[PDB]
Structure formats: C-alpha cells, structure tokens
From a paper:
Dye-decolorizing peroxidases (DyPs) are heme proteins with distinct structural properties and substrate specificities compared to classical peroxidases. Here, we demonstrate that [name] from the extremely radiation-resistant bacterium [name] is, like some other homologues, inactive at physiological pH. Structurally, [name]-type peroxidases also differ from the classical peroxidases. In contrast with the α-helix rich structures of the latter, DyPs are organized in two domains with a ferredoxin-like fold of four anti-parallel β-sheets surrounded by α-helices. A sequence analysis of DrDyP compared to four characterized and structurally determined members of the class V [name] family of DyPs, demonstrates that the proximal His heme ligand, and the four residues that are proposed to form the hydrogen peroxide binding pocket within this family of DyPs are conserved in DrDyP (H324, D189, R348, L373 and F375).
To gain more insight into the function of [name] from [name], both DrDyP and DrDyPM190G were crystallized and structurally determined to 2.20 and 1.53 Å resolution, respectively. DrDyP possesses one and DrDyPM190G possesses two molecules in the asymmetric unit, respectively. The final model of DrDyP (residue 19–460) contains one heme molecule, two glycerols, three Magnesium ions and 45 waters. In total, DrDyP contain 12 α-helices and 10 β-strands, with the β-sheets located mainly in the interior of the protein and the α-helices on the surface of the protein. A superimposition of the two structures demonstrates that they are almost identical with an RMSD value of 0.28. The assumed catalytic residue in both structures (Asp189 and Arg248) and the axial His324 are well-aligned relative to the heme. Interestingly, we could observe one hydroxyl group and one water molecule within the hydrogen bonding distance to the iron and the catalytic Asp189 and Arg248 on the distal side of the heme for DrDyPM190. This was not observed for the DrDyP structure and can most likely be explained with the lower resolution of this structure. DrDyP is inactive at physiological pH, due to the fact that the heme adopts 6cLS state at pH 7.5, as shown using the resonance Raman experiments. Like BsDyP, DrDyP’s reduction potential is in the moderately high range, which along with the high amount of the catalytically inactive 6cLS heme iron may explain its poor performance as a [name].
Numbering used by the authors: 19 to 460
Write the structure that this text describes.
C-alpha cells in the first residue's frame, strides 16, 4: 500500500538519482525575513512532490533549510525549540560527535559552510542537459527577482562518463526500502523499513513516530538532511591501488573492489568474487541480491570494507544491533573533472573533483553522527580494533585495512584520507505544506 502522503512529501525523499544525471547545488542566504518568505513562495510552484516517484521525471528541484534559515524566516521560538539540539548547533558545531577533526576539522572548510551563512540549500536534479537548464533558468530567475536573498555559492554536478563517481565506482545501488512507498523492494533490498525512520509524522521500527517539529504542519511529511561536500584525492587513491595491488594478485581492480566491497562496475564481491561481472553490476534486479551469511570471515566482502561497514546486513557484530535504525537514504552527486584511472601524479590530487552527499532520514543528524563515530572511524563493531573506513575515514598511514585471504589475513597500511570533508550542514527538508506555511509567516 501507499501509506505516505506522497503529494505532500518532497520528491527527493523518494526519487532515485536520475541516470545519467546533471544538476546544480545552490546555497542561499536570507538577508531579510520577507526576502526568505518570498523566495519560498516563488519556488514552491517548482518543488515537485513524491507523487508517482517510480515514474520518469526529467527534472525536479529540492529545498532544505538550516536552523539559521528557519530563525531568519521568523519561525517562532517555540517551533525553533522543537528541532533537535544537534540541528540547532549545526554540523560544524557538532564536529566532535562526527569525528570531523584533523583534515576534516571545520576550520579548513570551504567558505559558505560551517558559518551559519547557509539558510537554504537548493538542488536541481535532471536526466538530460536540456531539462537541467530549463529548471536552472527558472531557479536563477526567481533568485534574481527576490531582493532580500543573495546566492552564496553555486556548483554544477553530474555529466560524469557512465555516471561513475569521482573514484570511478558505480554508486547509488543500495538505498533502504520504505514500507508504504507503494513499491516492493529490488531483490536483496529488503526488508522495507518502517516509514517513520525516514519521514516525520509516521511510525518507525519501534511502532511510534519519532520526535518531530511543531506545529504539525511544519514537521509532518518532512525529514532531515545531512549535506556534506568532499574533495577526492584520486591521485593518492590511484597510487595506493598500484602500490598495494600485489596483495590481490597484481589486479588493481580487485583491490578497488575489496576496499568498497563492489567492483567499480557495481558487481558485489559476494556475487562476483574472482572476476568482474559488469552486466551483473548494471542490473538493479541482480546487483543487490545478497547477504553476508555465507561470508562470515570477509573472504569475499572484507568486514572493514565500505559497504559492509555502512550496511552490515546479517554480519555478526560485537554488540546487538538493529541495523534497521541505522539506515540512511543517500543522494550522491559527483562534481569536477571525470575520474581518470591512469592519472597518478601528486598534482592529480589538486584537481577540483569530488562528491556532494545528501543523506536523508527522520533522524539524519543522529544516524550521520552514529555512522561517522562508530562505523567509519572505529572498527570495534567488526572486531578489527582501530581500523577505519578505507574510502571516507580519517586515515593515518600506520592504521591498517584487513584483507582476508587463504590462508592468511593480510594487512595493508599507508592509506591517505581519500575523501576530505570540504563542508556540510544539517538541513530540514520540509513538506510541500510546510514550505507554504513558511512562506506565509508574519
Ligand atoms: C566520501 C566518499 C564516499 C564514496 C566515494 C562512497 C562510495 C560508495 C560506493 C561506491 C558505494 C557502493 C554503491 C552502493 O552500494 O550504492 C557506497 C555504498 C554506501 N555508502 Fe558510501 N561513499 C562515500 C561516503 C559515504 C558516507 C560519508 C556514508 C555514510 C555516513 C556512506 C554510506 C554508504 C551506504 C549506507 C552505502 C550502502 C551500503 C549498502 O546498503 O550495501 N558513504 N558508497
Ligand atoms: Mg525535492
Ligand atoms: Mg583521476
Ligand atoms: Mg573539490
């Protein structure tokens, strides 16, 4: 059944990223309360809802608002107080619960981020360059027309060869299935998570709705967003694959597969353990149909590989854990020059490429802080001590990655931080009704 008011929920909460994809991220500041309210009234016609999210849509526009954004809009103090504390503090201010330290410390963040300047994040997704522009010109026009707001930054994304990300992996394969979305999960995508884990106003896994913003028109059919921008050091990554390829029989593509858990083509190593299977990788009805019940030792998908860290499935962990409450919906967008596998100079790390991530969840701040602190930058849950995620963890050359083989558990060292945080924000992705309410304040 459809249990979700799809016509009130923003499209981005349920729509997969288009294939191929083009778009733009835009960070906006509200100079005056009335400027903010007006921008929303002008954008609101162009914010698509999640109606028939399984159908084709050549472009849609998303909007998500920071605490500072809500404050400036004039949201009353008793409504501001109903948002979680983490959201109030903002992402930079919560760096300690995110292990955003070292290279990722907020003092190094790119300009708009981490300062409270970002009030409104606008994202345009599109499947061809023509509808990207059509929606872009519409966005730019309404911005120009709104005195009282200024566009802080703007960056285009997508147009990647074969849609691969900034390290050449097929991304956007595994996202949680939502009970009540109207669509049965792809094989191996189950189980359908209770809808209140991802949309406010609805029961979660524990049977009751999560704490949500007040009044009901502001919080219902909304959700929370963790937006993070990374810079990718593909030079360092490439040199790492070459240096350590001896440990996977000279095959650098197998080593790239062991660090993520999937070949760059998308095939998971549980379904393609010895050689790539690019047709498997491209097929949504095949590329996710697996668990780890027959791989308890990480011989196929290593325990500390990226996808297995982020979604352990039936892996035995240290402490009891309901994986269902630690899921996140991801929208990844690669930006910058396309990834090149032969490029391994030091200067390749200086090419401005990377990823934007929009992580969506009714408790997005909690789950992002949880994943960052417990499953990316530690390995106690998998019994590998201080090993950290090879793709996005804050690496130290003397930390290791354990690559299980026959009959020896090989250890690798000398990793650099391959994806460096350039900034981020905790945002609130409001319902279509809540957006209208915000535009009619005061
Ligand atoms: C920063 C650079 C990152 C890169 C290059 C990257 C890349 C990937 C790739 C290639 C996959 C496999 C494709 C797929 O399963 O859809 C994946 C899966 C996943 N990643 Fe990341 N990712 C990054 C950051 C993050 C972060 C910060 C998080 C969470 C805090 C995250 C959470 C996940 C999850 C939940 C999955 C799905 C696992 C599953 O259901 O099997 N990723 N990522
Ligand atoms: Mg949307
Ligand atoms: Mg490259
Ligand atoms: Mg960059």
């Amino acid at each position: 059944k459809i249990d979700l008011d799809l016509d009130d929920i923003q499209a981005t909460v349920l729509r997969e990223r288009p294939e191929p994809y083009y778009g733009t991220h835009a960070m906006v500041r509200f100079d005056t309360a009335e400027g903010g309210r007006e921008l929303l009234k002008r954008l609101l016609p162009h914010i698509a809802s999640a109606e028939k999210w399984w159908d084709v849509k050549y472009a849609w526009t998303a909007a998500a608002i920071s605490y500072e954004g809500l404050k400036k809009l004039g949201v009353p103090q008793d409504s501001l107080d109903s948002f979680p504390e983490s959201f109030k503090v903002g992402m930079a201010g919560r760096a300690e619960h995110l292990f955003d330290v070292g290279e990722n410390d907020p003092k190094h963040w790119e300009k708009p981020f981490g300062t409270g300047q970002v009030h409104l994040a606008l994202t345009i997704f599109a499947e061809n360059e023509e509808n990207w522009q059509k929606a872009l010109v519409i966005a730019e026009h309404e911005l120009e027309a709104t005195k009282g707001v200024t566009l802080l930054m703007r960056e285009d994304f997508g147009a990647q060869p074969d849609s691969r990300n900034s390290l050449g992996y097929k991304d956007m394969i595994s996202n949680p299935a939502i009970e009540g979305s109207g669509i049965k999960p792809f094989p191996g995508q189950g189980p359908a998570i209770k809808p209140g884990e991802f949309v406010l106003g609805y029961p979660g896994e524990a049977g009751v709705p999560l704490g949500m913003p007040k009044p009901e028109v502001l919080g219902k059919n909304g959700t929370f967003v963790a937006l993070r921008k990374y810079h990718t050091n593909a030079g360092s990554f490439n040199r790492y694959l070459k240096e350590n390829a001896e440990y996977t029989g000279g095959d650098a593509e197998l080593l790239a597969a062991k660090l993520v858990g999937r070949w760059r083509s998308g095939a998971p190593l549980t379904l393609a353990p010895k050689e790539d299977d690019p047709e498997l990788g491209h097929d949504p009805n095949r590329n996710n149909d697996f668990t780890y019940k027959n791989d308890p030792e990480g011989l196929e998908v290593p325990l500390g590989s990226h996808i297995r860290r982020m979604n352990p499935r039936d892996t035995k962990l240290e402490l009891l854990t309901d994986v269902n409450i630690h899921r996140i919906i991801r929208r990844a967008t690669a930006y910058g020059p396309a990834y090149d596998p032969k490029a391994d100079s030091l200067a390749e790390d200086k090419v401005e490429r990377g990823l934007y991530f929009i992580f969506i969840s009714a408790k997005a701040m909690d789950t992002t802080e949880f994943l960052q602190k417990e499953w990316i930058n530690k390995a106690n849950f998998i019994g590998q001590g201080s090993e950290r995620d090879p793709i996005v963890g804050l690496q130290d050359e003397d930390l290791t990655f354990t690559l299980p083989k026959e009959p020896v558990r090989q250890r690798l060292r000398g990793m650099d931080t391959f994806n460096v945080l350039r900034g981020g924000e905790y945002l609130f992705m409001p319902s279509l009704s809540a957006l209208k309410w915000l535009s009619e304040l005061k």
